[PDB]
């Protein structure tokens, strides 16, 4: 659920969501990592977990359309840069 | 004397287990295609004959080859299994004898239907008209006697040779335990 | 398992010739044939090929015919002419995989157990290599359950011997532009790479549009791979990444600046020499 | 566009004068491509007693105006002086006068040709010296060199004989008074029969004699080409017919040449393409361009391709910026 | 009755590559094969394909061992869509240039007797280099006059080689121009051969290795600059002739500095531009 740019959960949040005390959060996250559900690290000093990859899941058509929109943005950026390079270097590449 | 590229469509279906027609319909049909291949070779030394099975979907065993030893040898290990797909088999045979070695040769298909055909009348007549346009003759043997009648086959042959074409044939053999080679006399001589 | 397939230019040009001749004959869309070659410990090498009679019904994906007797005869003759080449796979010019390809591959596996399919697009409306290599593999699912025979991609590249390279370079007097410098390093990449990436993303977008509207059903594996891609997309606003990027850019520009200074000094040297020569020549002529 | 406007203003200024400069006005009108004005001016001059103006103007028009421009001025006039003027625009008088001038002033040194003939040692130089003689005597009606060196000319064979026969037409440039019998005498019937090269050269020579000025020769060559059987004869006839009909978009000639082209023969095809270009010269006929370019892209004969390559450029003659699309496509 | 000099032999890309590959494979011998094609007009002899045949011989001669193979190959190619029949033969002369010997002339005589316009093609593999391929087409002259008629300049554009002239060119045989007409698909495939994958273009280059290479080249440029300073002090105490031989067996600091500058500029500019392009494209 968390967006890719933050994707940095905290011990209290995990405890509240999973109905377990803050102490067991580390063991829960380590079990997840060991099994292979999520990938990341644990920073006890700052009391945070940096999740970098969660297992793929089945998505509905609304989420597929969201992925399509994101692809549209990505393709627009690619085309913009291609046009920039072509226009600026037309002199050397004709 | 007439050049002819004749592809044989043999039926290795599960109804060939039946022993009604001599020592198993498989062996009866083996002898039948033996006599037919020998007859074609004797009729013309340059004549070329091949082999196709009408198993679950289809299988081409020996494309047009002037010799018959390879065809007969491959005929062994034709153990029966599966259903019969008449339309697909005949289409594959049509393609194979469209890709002939010699284009002056004529085109023929000898089919051994020893099992019911599940193709409707409309598809079979459509195939008949297509083959008539492409100038193919289809000699059909109503082997097996699973219906021993115009089991959507007389319509096929009549559509083929319509308007006094007298090119195709339909020899229907009774379950009489008489060698299928002994029974066949129309296509071999009076073709 | 194949790690790479090397397709020599003669194979490609022979495929083109086969396609052209069958097309001149008429009434055909795809061409098929055999790929003779050799093995180099998981690095294939396709060196030669020969045509094979082949026909198919444009409606039924189950009425197709391949003359394996002719295949065997021509393979015997090719072996008699060059022993070191043995059947390795089959090729077809169809723009994309057809549904009869697994059946044809099963037929050819009786001549080469590790048969490799190579699709050669003789009319490439794209920007990339013309060869795509596939190997038949059994796929075991978790919900798709029945294990089907699917085609798995294998890296394909074009290599050449010395004679083939010489011949291709001689024939390449159509449009020759080497310019190995920054010009080629800007055209062969950058522009080409961005265009190809846009093409692939457009293909993904078209498939996603079809899925969302409802023309095609959902493929959980494709959706999972797309999730992985979008996860891999990096973030370029991180302070650490920005700082590292600036550091490396500064180093590269240091080297560039030193090179430009060397260039300027050399240019000045040339100007001084030229002026000396011209002044001396004028003095001597006077 | 601005040049045309300025030329129109100049024409108006010429008109509004005590003694208008009708000659310069006709030049500017040729530039503007307005045969109506020149026809009107000629009509006014005849209505007056300025036959000298009329004759000089018509001479200048024939000498420096296009055939379509001349034809319109000959159709506007039509719909004793008028017959005389039209005979000037039709070009008969000018051709005859030039022929007379060249016949009378015919200073040419035959010693140089004799030296070249003696030095000749191969077929290439033989055909070269035949061509050089034709160039030297173009329009002079004289064939003394060929007449005296008859046994030396017989060495030429094949296309050398073709060129040798066409040299006669080159020499007799404009000698249209009696060309049919003049060529028949050189190419006698039932005399050494079986020289397709000679017959084709004769047709080519008639075309060269009547170059840019056809008439009955167009129809004669059309019939001869239709009845032709040998490829050499067809090639010579195509070249001659193209030269005769040069500039006149005659659909019958175009269709006959197109059929000869589609016959798909190299020797016939080259001449057919060149003749199509010559016939539909200047005109931007989309049909002609389409047919020629399509056949160039469809044929498998480099000779036909060469002929059509010249023909297309001839077709697009004159048109400055109307040729951009074709130029770009052909270059690509 | 002419045989003109504007006649050309059209060799397909496939035929040329097959010929060169077989010839190079048989480097010491004169390996040989047949050419299939059509006789289009009197100004074209189209060669569309060639196939080698079973042959055996020494470094002084090569001969075919079976004709059954040739017949069967012709039939089995016709069956797959190549009805073209033999129009000549090709064999390789490894390093002797292009010409025909006595045995070659006898073979060409047999081929001429069969078909009037049959041609022989000699391809020399080892003398061929990347840009150019040494290949020529030949036909014989009877015991007569001039062998051919010239109706154009196309024939006289090749300047026959001294070796061919010594070995009998224009006396026992004459050459025919070779042309390489191609179709659209052949052109496109030849152009596409060298095209690389798109990802290779955007792929970056290990920064450790890149920095190491930059460091190495700059360190080299330092010594080159020392030597350049030393060399600049010369070129005034040097004879106008002595300058040319001054750079024989001795390094040229100016040239090496220019080369290093070019390589460094290309590498660094490409890397920076690729880095920026990726920075934008990938989020
Ligand atoms: Zn030799």
Swiss-Prot record, chain A:
Residue positions where N6-acetyllysine is found in the record: 16
GO cellular component annotations of the record: cytosol; extracellular region; ficolin-1-rich granule lumen; membrane; nucleoplasm; nucleus; proteasome accessory complex; proteasome complex
Subunit structure comment from the entry: Component of the 19S proteasome regulatory particle complex. The 26S proteasome consists of a 20S core particle (CP) and two 19S regulatory subunits (RP). The regulatory particle is made of a lid composed of 9 subunits including PSMD13, a base containing 6 ATPases and few additional components.
Part of the full-length chain shown: 283 to 376 of 376
Organism field: Homo sapiens
Family to which this protein belongs: Belongs to the proteasome subunit S11 family.
Function, as annotated: Component of the 26S proteasome, a multiprotein complex involved in the ATP-dependent degradation of ubiquitinated proteins. This complex plays a key role in the maintenance of protein homeostasis by removing misfolded or damaged proteins, which could impair cellular functions, and by removing proteins whose functions are no longer required. Therefore, the proteasome participates in numerous cellular processes, including cell cycle progression, apoptosis, or DNA damage repair.
Protein name as annotated: 26S proteasome non-ATPase regulatory subunit 13
One BP annotation, GO: proteasome-mediated ubiquitin-dependent protein catabolic process
Swiss-Prot record, chain B:
Cross-link Glycyl lysine isopeptide (Lys-Gly) (interchain with G-Cter in SUMO2) residue location(s): 122
GO BP of this protein: proteasome-mediated ubiquitin-dependent protein catabolic process
Disulphide linkage map: none
Sequence ranges assigned to domain VWFA in this UniProt record: 5-188
GO cellular component, one term: nucleus
GO MF term set: identical protein binding; molecular adaptor activity; polyubiquitin modification-dependent protein binding; RNA binding
Role description: Component of the 26S proteasome, a multiprotein complex involved in the ATP-dependent degradation of ubiquitinated proteins. This complex plays a key role in the maintenance of protein homeostasis by removing misfolded or damaged proteins, which could impair cellular functions, and by removing proteins whose functions are no longer required. Therefore, the proteasome participates in numerous cellular processes, including cell cycle progression, apoptosis, or DNA damage repair.
Known partners and oligomeric status: Component of the 19S proteasome regulatory particle complex. The 26S proteasome consists of a 20S core particle (CP) and two 19S regulatory subunits (RP). The regulatory particle is made of a lid composed of 9 subunits, a base containing 6 ATPases and few additional components including PSMD4. Interacts with NUB1. Interacts with SQSTM1. Interacts with UBQLN4. Interacts with UBE3A. Interacts with UBQLN1 (via ubiquitin-like domain). Interacts with DDI2.
Domain statement: The 2 UIM motifs are involved in the binding to a multi-ubiquitin chain in a cooperative way.
The species this protein was found in: Homo sapiens
Gene (name only): PSMD4
Curated annotation (Swiss-Prot), chain C:
UniProt superkingdom: Eukaryota
One GO cellular component term: nucleoplasm
Acetylation found in the keyword field: yes
BP GO annotations: proteasome-mediated ubiquitin-dependent protein catabolic process
Keywords: Acetylation, Isopeptide bond, Proteasome, Ubl conjugation
Location in chain, cross-link Glycyl lysine isopeptide (Lys-Gly) (interchain with G-Cter in ubiquitin): 176
Any GO MF annotation of the entry: protein homodimerization activity
Family classification: Belongs to the peptidase M67A family.
Name of the protein in its database record: 26S proteasome non-ATPase regulatory subunit 7
Gene: PSMD7
Swiss-Prot record, chain E:
Residue ranges constituting the MPN domain according to the UniProt record: 9-144
Any one annotated GO CC term: cytosol
Gene Ontology molecular-function annotations: endopeptidase activator activity; K63-linked deubiquitinase activity; metal ion binding; metal-dependent deubiquitinase activity; metallopeptidase activity; proteasome binding
Domain of life: Eukaryota
Motif segment (JAMM motif): 91-104
One Pfam family hit: JAB
Residues modified as Phosphoserine: 128, 197
Function of the protein: Component of the 26S proteasome, a multiprotein complex involved in the ATP-dependent degradation of ubiquitinated proteins. This complex plays a key role in the maintenance of protein homeostasis by removing misfolded or damaged proteins, which could impair cellular functions, and by removing proteins whose functions are no longer required. Therefore, the proteasome participates in numerous cellular processes, including cell cycle progression, apoptosis, or DNA damage repair.
Subunit annotation: Component of the 19S proteasome regulatory particle complex. The 26S proteasome consists of a 20S core particle (CP) and two 19S regulatory subunits (RP). The regulatory particle is made of a lid composed of 9 subunits including PSMD4, a base containing 6 ATPases and few additional components. Within the complex, PSMD4 interacts with subunit PSMD7 through their respective MPN domain. Interacts with TXNL1.
Protein name: 26S proteasome non-ATPase regulatory subunit 14
Origin species: Homo sapiens (Human)
Gene (UniProt): PSMD14
